[PDB]
Each structure stands twice: as structure tokens, then as C-alpha cells.
Design a binder for this molecule. Sequence first.
Ligand SMILES: [N]S(=O)(=O)[C][C][C][C]C123[B@]45[B@]67[B@@]89[C@@]1%10B81%11B698B746B814B562B%10%1143
Ligand SMILES: [Zn+2]
Length: 257
Amino acid sequence: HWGYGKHNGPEHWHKDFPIAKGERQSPVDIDTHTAKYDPSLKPLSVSYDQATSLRILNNGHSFQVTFDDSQDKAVLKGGPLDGTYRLLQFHFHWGSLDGQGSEHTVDKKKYAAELHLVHWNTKYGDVGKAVQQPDGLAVLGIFLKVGSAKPGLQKVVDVLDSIKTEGKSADFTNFDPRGLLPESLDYWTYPGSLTTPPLAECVTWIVLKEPISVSSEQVLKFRKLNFNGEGEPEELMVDNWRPAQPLKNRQIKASFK
Ligand SMILES: [N]S(=O)(=O)[C][C][C][C]C123[B@]45[B@]67[B@@]89[C@@]1%10B81%11B698B746B814B562B%10%1143
Ligand SMILES: [Zn+2]
């Protein structure tokens, strides 16, 4: 029922999901001059060498690549986190044109897209339990700007024509998510929420300072996707981003000076 349009978009979500007006909603604008360098923050540990991708799916709001999360194979640790978080899926948010598409903003700047790698805390045993806890999820967010192609994204781009419409899926084995990461793991962090319904307040956000560059041809393929199902009136899957929400009583911390 929910979506990104005039009649079902972000301004409507609070009716079915009242937490939309909560105290720790995401995304937010990252004011770089107000974010506090925290020398107690540890380097982020990204251990993706044994990742096992399974499927790629158009879920009617984005496309996602899903992973086997039944053992510690692709895990996030360190940084602001206590314990171990397993990679479940990644997906993207993007715009109709290159000047919008990201969910987080940096000094009000919008990037062309944003990659979210979604992880859950192993101490809660499964993701459905983790989303009920304030420290249940860790989402690693990476900005995309348009420039040179990202080689590690091409395998994704080349299969999008097979999942054009909603609920369509394909095999997507042997994909290495290390190929989506920028050089630096410098980050901002704050406590927040899912940016899509149910908007649960369960996420430690880790947003990388360094964007990745993707080519115009790569992002053009994202924009050929459809929100609609097969045979239904065609509506391009574009502008699938929630705008920045009030920071309220939260501090954004920087891992770098
Ligand atoms: N854009 S974002 O990265 O904030 C969304 C993170 C939600 C991921 C989820 B997957 B499916 B639906 C939602 B519920 B259930 B599992 B549970 B985890 B959260
Ligand atoms: Zn997301």
C-alpha cells in the first residue's frame, strides 16, 4: 500500500506507521560542522570475504541482493558497534535526475543515490527479533555520485532487465559486495530507524564520508526499473527516497577529524 507517490508517499506513512513521527527517525541531514569527532570510536571492521549472495529481487520499492545470514560469513563489527552484525541484504535509493536520490544529506547536499548494506545483531538470533530492539540493526550507508563507472556494480546492472517489475527475482550467486566499497571507511554515526515502513527505531547508522562513483549508464539502468507489477500501468522506479527527518535529541559523531 505505501510507496513514494503523492497519495501514498512519505507524508502519508505516519497513518499506518505512527512511529514515523518518532524521536529517532532516519534519514537525517548530516551537518558536518556540528558532528563531533569522537576519538573513542573504533575503525569499522567489514569482513565480507566469505559472503554468500543468493538472489536479486524487485520488491516494488527498490531492488535488493540477499545473502545467506545463517552463519557469520559477511559481518560488520567495531566502529560504534558492540558485538557482531550479519549482512542480510543490500539495496539502493535513487532519483529521477542526478541532483537527488540519496536519503541522508551532507550539509544539505543530495547525492544521486545511496547504497544501504543491512546487517542484524547476532545476539537476537534472527532479523525479525532484531528489528524489535534499539540496537538490533546496523546499516552501512554509502553515497553514489555520477562520474566514472564502478566495476563492482556492473554485475548488478546487467541483470536489472530481468527483474523489471515487482516480485520478480533471479539467481544472484557469487556476488562480492567488497566491490561496492570506497577506499576510506571514515564515517558518521547516529541512532536512527529504518527509512521504509515499518520505520522501526532499531538502527545504528554508519554513513561513509567517501562516495563511490558510478557511471551515467549504470544509474540510467536503475531508472528503467518499474514500481509496478507486470502488465500494470508503467511507473518508473525513481525517487524512492525518504527525505531528511528531524534530528531531535541526537548527536551525530564522526570517526575522523
Ligand atoms: N532503507 S533501510 O536500509 O533503512 C531498510 C532496512 C530494512 C530492512 C528490513 B528487511 B525486511 B523488512 C525491513 B523489515 B523486514 B527485514 B526487517 B529487515 B527490516
Ligand atoms: Zn535503504
